[PDB]
Symmetry: C5
Subunit: 326 residues, 5 copies
């Protein structure tokens, strides 16, 4: 055969651990590129971002050299990674118990030693979610690619010469804004220095799920508490309303506690609003109890009207403070 | 033996990476067929469709050639895939961390080099679910099969010559409509072009689960709110009803939020209806509070009757807008 | 040694892929037996039945032959399956991503070529659950064993000669009735025919869990709705009862929706009973609202009594329709 | 080297399948000991007991013999199990898909052939939980260790000579009582007999979790129903109380159904008590409805007092029946 | 090549099991260091602490010796662990079924035999959580590193010479306080002694999640019960309030039972407070029932006022007992 003849004369003394270089002091310019093709999910229960992405590798090789003219062309050979040298580049923040590479069993090589291994991975990364703007947030996620084993004396992890990765993966759940990747030198200690590549994926929330399960029932309960103090205390239904509002706000807290995770850096604004409808039922229940105790002059109507006006201006300033997000 | 004699003279210099071809510029017509035998599940929490399917492969081989007449027949040999060449065809949208394969340890070969490897897989695919018609949807799922490693210069991923796959797997949960598969040339870049095969599985919802857990309690709460404004405000039970309707609609929202996932492209119509019963309770609670404040002329009966008529025509036009799905 | 001397002269040219036969047209009678020793679980969320079972294999061999008399007895040798031929028999309906096998690393061989490999597996099978009789069902489960790779021209998957597997594994959760296994010839196409073995495990429900979490609260709410219309409408508690019945039936629907899975072929009878207590609260709430509107002649007592009698006969005929299951 | 010289002359013809023995009719006394160091969890959803334990093995060897005096001592050599013979001892009731053995890559050998392989495993075992005493139960768990492959003609699975394993692992969740292990001969059939070792771990419940989430709210609802019939029926709050008791007992059933698993052999006593507070709320709601129908002579006070006394003596005899557990 | 020439003359007779030493009685000083870089999660459902950490290893070697001057420098060689000796150091409390290792496929070696293998792991450890201070706890976690296979006669697991690991990983969920690691000699038996290293990670709770889902609704329900007894019993709403308080406290118990795990050593103080609001509703419901029975002299106002004062002083002393934590 033709490919078998060249393959029998290119891995004669090739190990999967020898760094391909001519001079020991010389390094290898292992280029890298990250291309997220589809963001799978973002769960804040354990700060996990699952994406599907291509991890483009490109390093020069010294031993994979052949002349094409005596081998009848054959400028591209498909070589598995189990019989070729492989860099130890990994996610710095991995959530899986092990690092997995879908379709990582093949890698092309060129006639100039231009291995272009492109595996595809379900990357599970860790990002800091600023949930003070929840749900209408713009918290970017950073993915780190580097080698923990060898350092800048062995490899030089750089960005791709052509960095045309300024895409926008408009999904049905998030708006994805790609950031042009940067290179930073992470230092293990003072004497030794390493390399690393940061890529950024900004996520913009656009779904109307959280405006349906949280915002609309909370603003409707706020509207109900705003309409609460018009009922006279002698009707024997104001306290029943108030305790029904307590039960409804407790069910809203049950939904929020089952949905919003344990990771809090700042209190969410929907959680702050739920605290508000609560601190209202408590305040208007106190005023209703005091009104029905005073009823047993009819001064309570003016007190309820001024209380309604104060709650009106407080609720409208809280809702226009909330509306600055959207 | 007879099979051992032929097997000892067919893998003398066979590697698991050499592409079987005679001329380098020539390609191999790697045929493909997808046959879903049983759709396991469809979960919209992370856009996962789990199916059980056969992935029929058929490629011509150049090195697996023998004359049968001097080997006493033996037109079919069972050869494991670990000692034979294997294409790198995969799902383009895989949800598992690694590609699973059930019964992939054997593959038949013919005397003309007609390897017919048929593995079986639990394919976990990603589809775009148009949930605006939820639950009575007809959102098709697309499964993509292609090679990321080699391109049209090496293999040619084509359809089966006999494409008799127009079945209909009538299950107890979905109606499965198979679509005749098509071939599209996905391009990694401008200079290089690759191959891919799209197969389609249309899912028709036929279960009465979502008509029992969502539609019937929501239409019963709508019927209850329709019957609400007949109660006189002096009976001290209209506000109690209204707040009980608030609690019941909150429990319905709790069931919907625990069931309907975070992925929303459009608001579901059952979710829109749950918004309607909510906006009713709020509106009829406002009118009940204003009626019991006016009661403390008896004009409220005509107001409640016209309100009941307006709610009657609005509820019936909303239900006949809903009934166009079913 | 004695075993090492025979082992060094029995795997001289043995591969893990050569089918052991003398003539090519001859087949091998690969016998099979299934013995479920303990049914682990049955979850209807994805039609999964987890059992622990022995998969008895017995095939004649042509190459594993030795005379015992010159080897000092030694009629039984323990040989691992990694160095011996192995059939590709599998579950036709597997739920795991890969086929698991517990204690599959050893297999006895006899002096006549009588390999008796008995692995043990946690089989995850798929069955059609007729949930119209839920919870008091008798839906059998079918487990299929066959080879997808080779056909009746190579192996002949037959029953055990001694089929004494008519046991009864009486567990604390189910009653297990073993069915005598049958053999059917599944056909991949018209020209080629394959083999398969069906074994049956009938499951009888005997637990009092579903009679405690579903049947007793639903029949108690039905009893409460039966006792509902005796309250006079002027007591201002009939509508409160009715809405409390709505809340209780909604909590019952919440428990049922969180427990009963998405797979419905037919509506469960407990679900039908729940849709009935709901259709009652709705009907008696309508009659209570009309009675309190008519009260604002005292004809409502006779109407409530005839309504109570009609609901009495309807509830008793529904409960004696339900009682035919148990 | 010294260890390399002995290691190069001890595995010259050693396979991982030859049973180490001199005479074929002779057997090997493979001793065994189980030492649970920490019980991880016990979940009754699928009868799983997760423990961390040492599985001490000790078998005599015939081929691992050397004289120490010409090898400069070296009485202990660390040998991995991949290059030494290994018994096929396993859990008879395993919940994992495949057998795990954390720290199983090394095993010491002595100069007399005294291999002392001690792996450590997260054993997932199956026990029969007698939940009639739930939560204050004393249901022991049995762990079975035996070989399915070879029988008493090959190995003899016996106890340790020194059985000092009478410890007591006092944890924060359970009290662990070790049982001295026994040996039983499990029979695959009539002609052939095998060996097995039973070890027992008795679990005593001591946590106050289930006395907080179940016992205290149920006894408080029973106290509330005991205090229920003192309210006069003309106050229009007795029926509201009763339906609030129905809602509270329904929430208690929701907590119990979400916590107590589907496996029931007998009804739990806490489940029987929730059942009492229910049938109790039903009976006093019937008597309250009949009292408010009779009110529309004032004989109902004596009826309510005798009903309260009967409920008092019934509740106190039920609570002293419950108190015999604790 | 240069690296290939040295690599072909350094693993000539190297096995992955020979302990590298010159004299048999001599030991190897296998140093160790633990560096937690990011604490992933702490779940008390099964006492699991998931951290991401570096496990620094450093042992002297006897066989990995070369002179650099005739090899043109090359003081550092990257060698995979599959072809080099590896200590069996592990977590003593592991929650995973098998020991996972991220980037463990490479390890540097120096010219003096100074292997510096640094793998990175998602360590799942077990700690005793003193939940009597929940949520404002300071329960440290202990991670144990040692070898179960060989003992102090073979290796000597010691600290790093430079122990500069006094960092503080200030996260958004916990405050991490590193403890300087210590060495303890765990004994398998009396005759033999082993080695082990304890490292400590103290976790300080700083999130406001549990102050939002538990503390604020419980203190608001306590405030509501404090405001409860002012309502006159003739208003027919005191019993309705009390039963609404019962329903709200039951929903709070539902949230607590779904969140707080089964592992209890001591009752949490938030759980004790939830007991207090419950025992109040029960006590004030008893007093409300007795007041409405006495109403059917007006001495109940003074009784309610003294009851309110006693509940005021009891609630304020309970809240200032709670406030000592924060
Ligand atoms: C790695 O590449 C960067 C790119 O500018 C260069 O500045 C740096 O000197 C390189 N490192 C080495 C060791 O050559
Ligand atoms: C692959 O097959 C299609 C089928 O028509 C053909 O048009 C195309 O030219 C083929 N590609 C190559 C490279 O031969
Ligand atoms: C397989 O066994 C059945 C048992 O009766 C027999 O009828 C059939 O002919 C056999 N098949 C072959 C190919 O021998
Ligand atoms: C195995 O050991 C027991 C211990 O008493 C002994 O009774 C039995 O005979 C032994 N079995 C064989 C086959 O030697
Ligand atoms: C291990 O190191 C400690 C450090 O002080 C030392 O005391 C001890 O003797 C050493 N053990 C051996 C066996 O050398």
């Amino acid at each position: 055969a033709d490919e078998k003849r060249l393959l029998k004369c290119i891995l004669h003394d090739y190990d999967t651990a020898i760094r391909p270089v001519q001079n020991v002091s010389d390094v290898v310019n292992v280029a890298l590129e990250v291309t997220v093709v589809k963001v799978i999910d973002l769960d804040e229960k354990e700060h996990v971002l699952t994406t599907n992405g291509w991890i483009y590798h490109e390093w020069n090789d010294f031993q994979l050299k052949w002349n094409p003219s005596d081998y009848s062309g054959l400028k591209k050979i498909r070589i598995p990674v189990d019989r070729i040298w492989t860099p130890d580049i990994v996610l710095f923040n991995n959530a899986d118990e092990s690092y997995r590479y879908v379709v990582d069993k093949l890698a092309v090589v060129y006639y100039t030693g231009k291995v272009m291994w492109v595996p595809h991975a379900r990357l599970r990364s860790f990002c800091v979610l600023d949930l003070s703007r929840f749900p209408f947030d713009s918290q970017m996620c950073t993915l780190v690619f580097g080698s923990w084993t060898h350092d800048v004396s062995s490899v030089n992890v750089t960005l791709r010469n052509q960095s045309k990765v300024q895409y926008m993966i408009d999904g049905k759940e998030w708006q994805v804004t790609s950031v042009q990747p940067k290179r930073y030198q992470w230092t293990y200690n003072s004497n030794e220095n390493y390399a690393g590549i940061i890529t950024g994926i900004k996520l913009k929330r656009t779904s109307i799920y959280y405006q349906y399960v949280f915002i609309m029932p909370t603003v409707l309960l706020a509207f109900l508490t705003l309409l609460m103090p018009f009922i006279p205390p002698l009707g024997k239904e104001r306290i029943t309303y108030g305790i029904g509002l307590v039960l409804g706000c407790t069910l809203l807290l049950m939904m929020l506690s089952d949905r919003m995770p344990t990771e809090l850096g700042n209190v969410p604004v929907v959680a702050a609003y739920l605290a508000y409808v609560f601190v209202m039922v408590a305040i208007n229940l106190l005023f209703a109890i005091m009104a029905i105790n005073m009823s047993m002059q009819q001064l309570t109507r003016v007190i309820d009207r001024l209380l309604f006006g104060s709650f009106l201006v407080l609720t409208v300033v809280i809702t226009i403070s909330m509306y600055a997000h959207y």
